[PDB]
């Protein structure tokens, strides 16, 4: 049977190359485990447990809405509000301050001056990632303070002058190897 021999040969070749690259994988270090350990140490220091959030890039708005619902009172919170409603509120806040959003829409990493109205429409009507300036504007509009804890970086606080309770979330860059991901943090 030449076919069973061919099958065994290709299986042995796949296993050998898998072990050969597994040696290089074991040689390389993992920033994900170190970032997870540092985030666990920071969460143990802050005594608040991290809550998982959904992928596809709507994690920022969903985590902000979940942290605001955990922080604010149930009477002040509205059931009609959603992640798309939060993106629309961020777009309306960007339209409220067009001059500040215009310098925020221009990005050195993107190397082009994007329009503020186009960026607001892309944030409201598409699943692209919301900017830090748009998230800060939405937090200032909803008057809930936003606390961002990053592993290996100092803790950041935005919109702390708002009357509503502070919202805690963590953005981890190495936890997802593709890029940064935001997860809401609830007090335990």
């Amino acid at each position: 049977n030449r076919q069973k021999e061919r099958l065994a040969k290709r299986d042995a070749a796949i296993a050998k190359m898998k072990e050969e690259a597994a040696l290089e994988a074991s040689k390389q270090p993992d920033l994900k485990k170190m970032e997870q350990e540092s985030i666990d140490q920071l969460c143990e220091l802050k005594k608040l447990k991290q809550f998982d959030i959904q992928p596809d890039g709507h994690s920022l708005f969903a985590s902000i809405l979940d942290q605001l619902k955990l922080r604010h009172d149930p009477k002040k919170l509205d059931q009609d509000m959603d992640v798309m409603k939060l993106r629309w509120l961020s777009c309306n806040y960007v339209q409220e301050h067009r001059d500040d959003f215009i310098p925020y829409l221009f990005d050195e990493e993107t190397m082009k001056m994007k329009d503020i109205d186009e960026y607001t429409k892309e944030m409201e009507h598409t699943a692209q990632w919301g900017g830090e300036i748009e998230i800060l504007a939405l937090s200032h509009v909803f008057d809930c303070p936003i606390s961002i804890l990053m592993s290996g970086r100092p803790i950041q606080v935005y919109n702390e002058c708002g009357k509503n309770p502070e919202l805690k979330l963590v953005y981890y860059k190495h936890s997802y190897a593709l890029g940064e991901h935001y997860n809401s943090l609830h007090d335990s």
């Binding site: 796949i14 190359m17 898998k18 072990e19 050969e20 690259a21 597994a22 290089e24 994988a25 074991s26 390389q28 270090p29 993992d30 994900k32 485990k33 959904q54 992928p55 596809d56 890039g57 598409t126 699943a127 692209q128 990632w129 997802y176 190897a177 593709l178 890029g179 991901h181």
Partner: protein, 184 residues
């Protein structure tokens, strides 16, 4: 390279997801060389009623257990990498036609190569982390048949937003309408 992850046919979007594949390969050494041996045959775009299109990634059949080991993780990175998208992995299986009376015999057709068998297989492969607990077929008075699939209530959080995507891709691939239910 991006050409190695692609099996036969190169177009632009499969080259993009091959670049995403090798970017996930070089990063995350805990899953490195678990995703290295596998290649995928083709990519298909499915339009859904929700407006977020679906990546039907057709892969070789014998390599399917390797995707089954790491499928949750690579699907999570694939939803993150592409906005307004839902990714699904299917195995491109061969359907052999039913031999008629006039036709010459071409060996014996195996029962895994029939149309209903591969349709049930791709229906299972749509919902991977869940397990199907039952099926039903509604025979309506108009003559239409709508197949209802019952899913086990455990770990449905992975796929609960993607059910209408499953309905759209199954309606495109097989021409049959299905409705998912979760018995509780």
């Amino acid at each position: 390279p991006q050409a190695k992850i692609l099996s036969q046919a190169p177009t632009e979007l499969e080259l993009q997801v091959a670049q995403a594949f090798v970017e996930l390969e070089n990063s995350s050494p805990e899953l490195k060389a678990e995703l290295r041996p596998l290649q995928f045959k083709s990519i298909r775009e499915i339009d859904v009623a929700g407006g977020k299109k679906a990546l039907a990634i057709f892969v070789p059949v014998p390599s399917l257990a390797g995707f089954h080991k790491v499928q949750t993780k690579l699907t999570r990175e694939l939803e993150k990498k592409f906005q307004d998208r839902h990714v699904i992995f299917l195995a491109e299986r061969r359907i052999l036609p039913k031999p008629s009376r006039t036709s010459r015999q071409v060996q014996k057709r195996p029962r895994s190569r029939t149309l209903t068998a591969v349709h049930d297989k791709i229906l299972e492969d749509l919902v991977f982390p869940t397990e199907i607990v039952g099926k039903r077929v509604r025979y309506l008075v108009g003559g239409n048949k709508i197949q209802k699939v019952l899913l086990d209530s455990k770990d449905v959080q992975q796929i609960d937003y993607k059910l209408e995507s499953f309905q759209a891709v199954y309606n495109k691939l097989t021409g049959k309408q299905i409705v998912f239910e979760i018995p509780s």
